Design an enzyme around this catalytic site. Structure first.
Site, PDB file in Angstrom:
ATOM      1  N   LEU A 206      42.205  53.880  58.715  1.00 11.82           N
ATOM      2  CA  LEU A 206      41.138  53.156  58.017  1.00 11.82           C
ATOM      3  C   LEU A 206      40.959  53.664  56.597  1.00 11.82           C
ATOM      4  O   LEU A 206      40.645  52.897  55.684  1.00 11.82           O
ATOM      5  CB  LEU A 206      39.809  53.270  58.780  1.00 11.82           C
ATOM      6  CG  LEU A 206      39.805  52.546  60.125  1.00 11.82           C
ATOM      7  CD1 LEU A 206      38.478  52.695  60.881  1.00 11.82           C
ATOM      8  CD2 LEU A 206      40.150  51.086  59.912  1.00 11.82           C
ATOM      9  N   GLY A 207      41.141  54.966  56.415  1.00 13.28           N
ATOM     10  CA  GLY A 207      41.050  55.554  55.096  1.00 13.28           C
ATOM     11  C   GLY A 207      41.458  57.009  55.100  1.00 13.28           C
ATOM     12  O   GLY A 207      41.716  57.598  56.154  1.00 13.28           O
TER      13      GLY A 207
ATOM     14  N   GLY B  96      40.550  60.832  52.845  1.00 12.01           N
ATOM     15  CA  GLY B  96      39.924  61.599  51.788  1.00 12.01           C
ATOM     16  C   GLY B  96      40.751  62.844  51.548  1.00 12.01           C
ATOM     17  O   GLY B  96      41.917  62.904  51.945  1.00 12.01           O
TER      18      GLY B  96
ATOM     19  N   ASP C 224      25.394  63.486  50.250  1.00 11.05           N
ATOM     20  CA  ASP C 224      26.391  62.510  49.815  1.00 11.05           C
ATOM     21  C   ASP C 224      25.914  61.102  50.106  1.00 11.05           C
ATOM     22  O   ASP C 224      26.660  60.262  50.598  1.00 11.05           O
ATOM     23  CB  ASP C 224      27.746  62.780  50.497  1.00 11.05           C
ATOM     24  CG  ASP C 224      28.938  62.195  49.728  1.00 11.05           C
ATOM     25  OD1 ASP C 224      28.781  61.710  48.583  1.00 11.05           O
ATOM     26  OD2 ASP C 224      30.058  62.236  50.284  1.00 11.05           O
TER      27      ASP C 224
ATOM     28  N   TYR D 180      40.217  66.028  52.693  1.00 15.75           N
ATOM     29  CA  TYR D 180      40.357  66.957  53.807  1.00 15.75           C
ATOM     30  C   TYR D 180      40.301  66.260  55.169  1.00 15.75           C
ATOM     31  O   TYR D 180      40.171  66.920  56.201  1.00 15.75           O
ATOM     32  CB  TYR D 180      39.276  68.040  53.709  1.00 15.75           C
ATOM     33  CG  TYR D 180      38.980  68.415  52.273  1.00 15.75           C
ATOM     34  CD1 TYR D 180      39.912  69.110  51.510  1.00 15.75           C
ATOM     35  CD2 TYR D 180      37.783  68.050  51.670  1.00 15.75           C
ATOM     36  CE1 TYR D 180      39.656  69.438  50.191  1.00 15.75           C
ATOM     37  CE2 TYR D 180      37.518  68.379  50.350  1.00 15.75           C
ATOM     38  CZ  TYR D 180      38.459  69.074  49.617  1.00 15.75           C
ATOM     39  OH  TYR D 180      38.200  69.402  48.304  1.00 15.75           O
TER      40      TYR D 180
ATOM     41  N   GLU E  79      41.513  62.306  57.491  1.00 17.28           N
ATOM     42  CA  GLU E  79      41.954  60.933  57.603  1.00 17.28           C
ATOM     43  C   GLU E  79      41.190  60.273  58.732  1.00 17.28           C
ATOM     44  O   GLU E  79      40.892  60.905  59.745  1.00 17.28           O
ATOM     45  CB  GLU E  79      43.460  60.853  57.854  1.00 17.28           C
ATOM     46  CG  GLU E  79      44.295  61.126  56.616  1.00 17.28           C
ATOM     47  CD  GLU E  79      45.757  60.767  56.809  1.00 17.28           C
ATOM     48  OE1 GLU E  79      46.240  60.818  57.957  1.00 17.28           O
ATOM     49  OE2 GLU E  79      46.416  60.419  55.811  1.00 17.28           O
TER      50      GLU E  79
ATOM     51  N   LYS F 283      38.295  60.963  63.201  1.00 18.18           N
ATOM     52  CA  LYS F 283      38.441  61.631  61.915  1.00 18.18           C
ATOM     53  C   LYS F 283      39.186  62.946  62.127  1.00 18.18           C
ATOM     54  O   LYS F 283      38.643  63.911  62.682  1.00 18.18           O
ATOM     55  CB  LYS F 283      37.062  61.848  61.273  1.00 18.18           C
ATOM     56  CG  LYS F 283      37.051  62.681  59.990  1.00 18.18           C
ATOM     57  CD  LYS F 283      35.618  62.769  59.448  1.00 18.18           C
ATOM     58  CE  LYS F 283      35.422  63.883  58.428  1.00 18.18           C
ATOM     59  NZ  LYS F 283      33.999  63.927  57.958  1.00 18.18           N
TER      60      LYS F 283
HETATM   61  N1  LIG Z   1      32.260  54.979  62.643  1.00 17.75           N
HETATM   62  C1  LIG Z   1      33.084  54.028  61.882  1.00 17.75           C
HETATM   63  N2  LIG Z   1      33.298  52.775  62.347  1.00 17.75           N
HETATM   64  C2  LIG Z   1      34.071  51.893  61.650  1.00 17.75           C
HETATM   65  N3  LIG Z   1      34.629  52.213  60.492  1.00 17.75           N
HETATM   66  C3  LIG Z   1      34.472  53.494  59.912  1.00 17.75           C
HETATM   67  C4  LIG Z   1      33.695  54.436  60.595  1.00 17.75           C
HETATM   68  C5  LIG Z   1      33.718  55.644  59.779  1.00 17.75           C
HETATM   69  I1  LIG Z   1      32.745  57.467  60.188  1.00 17.75           I
HETATM   70  C6  LIG Z   1      34.505  55.322  58.655  1.00 17.75           C
HETATM   71  N4  LIG Z   1      34.940  54.052  58.771  1.00 17.75           N
HETATM   72  C7  LIG Z   1      35.744  53.385  57.848  1.00 17.75           C
HETATM   73  O1  LIG Z   1      36.969  54.349  57.395  1.00 17.75           O
HETATM   74  C8  LIG Z   1      37.099  54.294  56.079  1.00 17.75           C
HETATM   75  C9  LIG Z   1      36.804  55.669  55.467  1.00 17.75           C
HETATM   76  O2  LIG Z   1      35.487  56.035  55.786  1.00 17.75           O
HETATM   77  C10 LIG Z   1      36.062  53.241  55.582  1.00 17.75           C
HETATM   78  O3  LIG Z   1      36.669  52.047  55.373  1.00 17.75           O
HETATM   79  C11 LIG Z   1      35.044  53.135  56.743  1.00 17.75           C
HETATM   80  O4  LIG Z   1      34.493  51.815  56.779  1.00 17.75           O
END
Ligand SMILES: Nc1ncnc2c1c(I)cn2[C@@H]1O[C@H](CO)[C@@H](O)[C@H]1O
Length: 327
Positions: free
Chosen positions: A44-45, A47, A155, A49, A51, A67
């Site tokens: 999904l994304g 940073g 943040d 430190y 992913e 994460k």
């Molecule tokens: N609990 C969640 N449910 C759905 N999507 C999630 C999260 C979380 I924590 C983050 N993201 C998505 O991942 C990317 C980086 O944060 C972003 O695109 C963010 O939207």
């Protein structure tokens, strides 16, 4: 002579009257779930430190978010875990569902409830006056809760506020920079997104508190009702304070610095210049006026103040007439 010290005007000693176990995350021993419960579906994304992946819990077929934490300081991982555990079940706080460790490589991952976040471009075009008040109120619930539990988020920004608009669902996420408040403690000022950094951070005043989050929230409010995202758009940290001073004025900035006996870089004075305090109405136009009201401006005015001790607390904010219809 150094700066005048400061402490939070609310929730000052919440960690002081809690057991060491509550805030001592360093001594926190972690109990790990089963990493083979989860299958990664897509990234999904990423940073610096970590992913973040969409995943499925294969025991019940529910979507989650995983994460995976890059090999950084173990103390920072333990801090984020302790804070998430402490706040779990709080209003609109993202739910940490599991914590897993790859049993061979020792890589840890946090597992969160899944939020089906509405596309920004869609929200930008659809949110009504009432929607904004509602979601602002829900963010305030989250901030009052974590502040009352002795934690600063540090943040607060739109990307860390997930909204599933079709279920009217909001979650405050990314607690990676969050920290326990202890009165007199000097904190790292390198927190928050540039655009949402409070004046105390930009002038390197380290003895800040929960009120930092309230500045960040004020920036979000301004961005939403004036439809300019981000509202204060500096190209670096020095310029960020200039963008603030062009709206709030330089006079109150220098009064703030004066009150706390803060010293500015010589160059700072020269680029700050001289700027009148503007009226909020200056930013109201045909395209955003349906989102702006007298109470919205009064509320905003009470969040975006230089002096961190003069900003509304989360609790006081929730009492504001802006939220009458919501409450
Ligand atoms: N609990 C969640 N449910 C759905 N999507 C999630 C999260 C979380 I924590 C983050 N993201 C998505 O991942 C990317 C980086 O944060 C972003 O695109 C963010 O939207």
């Amino acid at each position: 002579s150094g700066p005048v010290p400061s402490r939070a005007r609310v929730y000052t000693d919440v960690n002081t009257h809690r057991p060491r176990e509550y805030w001592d995350y360093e001594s926190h021993v972690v109990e790990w779930g089963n990493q083979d419960d989860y299958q990664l579906v897509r990234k999904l994304g990423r940073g610096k430190y970590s992913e973040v992946f969409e995943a499925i819990n294969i025991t019940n077929n529910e979507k989650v978010v995983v994460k995976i934490l890059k090999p950084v300081k173990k103390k920072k991982i333990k801090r984020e875990i302790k804070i998430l555990e402490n706040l779990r079940g709080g209003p609109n706080i993202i739910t940490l569902a599991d914590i897993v460790k790859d049993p061979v490589s020792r890589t840890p991952a946090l597992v969160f409830e899944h939020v089906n976040n509405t596309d920004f471009k869609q929200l930008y075009q659809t949110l009504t006056d009432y929607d904004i008040r509602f979601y602002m109120y829900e963010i305030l619930k989250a901030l009052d809760y974590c502040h009352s539990m002795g934690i600063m988020h540090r943040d607060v920004k739109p990307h860390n506020v997930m909204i599933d608009h079709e279920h009217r669902k909001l979650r405050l996420i990314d607690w990676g920079l969050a920290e326990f408040y202890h009165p007199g403690q000097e904190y790292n000022v390198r927190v928050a997104s540039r655009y949402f950094k409070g004046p105390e951070l930009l002038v390197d005043y380290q003895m800040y508190d929960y009120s930092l989050d309230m500045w960040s929230l004020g920036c979000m409010l301004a961005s939403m009702i004036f439809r300019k995202e981000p509202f204060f758009h500096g190209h670096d940290n020095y310029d960020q304070l200039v963008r603030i001073a062009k709206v709030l004025g330089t006079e109150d900035l220098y009064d703030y610095i004066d009150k706390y006996n803060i010293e500015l870089d010589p160059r700072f004075n020269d680029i700050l210049g001289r700027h009148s305090r503007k009226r909020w109405e200056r930013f109201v136009h045909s395209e955003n006026q349906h989102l702006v009201s007298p109470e919205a401006l009064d509320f905003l005015d009470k969040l975006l103040r230089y002096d961190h001790q003069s900003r509304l607390t989360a609790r006081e904010a929730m009492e504001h007439p802006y939220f009458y219809t919501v409450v």
